[PDB]
Amino acid sequence: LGGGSVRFGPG
Protein backbone atom coordinates (compact mmCIF):
# COMPACT_ATOMS: atom_id res chain seq x y z
CA LEU A 1 0.00 0.00 0.00
CA GLY A 2 2.08 2.91 -1.34
CA GLY A 3 1.64 6.18 0.57
CA GLY A 4 0.28 4.19 3.53
CA SER A 5 1.52 3.81 7.11
CA VAL A 6 5.10 3.37 5.88
CA ARG A 7 6.50 5.42 2.99
CA PHE A 8 7.07 3.03 0.07
CA GLY A 9 10.01 3.66 -2.26
CA PRO A 10 8.46 1.50 -5.12
CA GLY A 11 5.53 3.94 -5.20
Coordinates of C-alpha atoms in Angstrom, one line a residue:
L1 CA 0.0 0.0 0.0
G2 CA 2.1 2.9 -1.3
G3 CA 1.6 6.2 0.6
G4 CA 0.3 4.2 3.5
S5 CA 1.5 3.8 7.1
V6 CA 5.1 3.4 5.9
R7 CA 6.5 5.4 3.0
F8 CA 7.1 3.0 0.1
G9 CA 10.0 3.7 -2.3
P10 CA 8.5 1.5 -5.1
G11 CA 5.5 3.9 -5.2

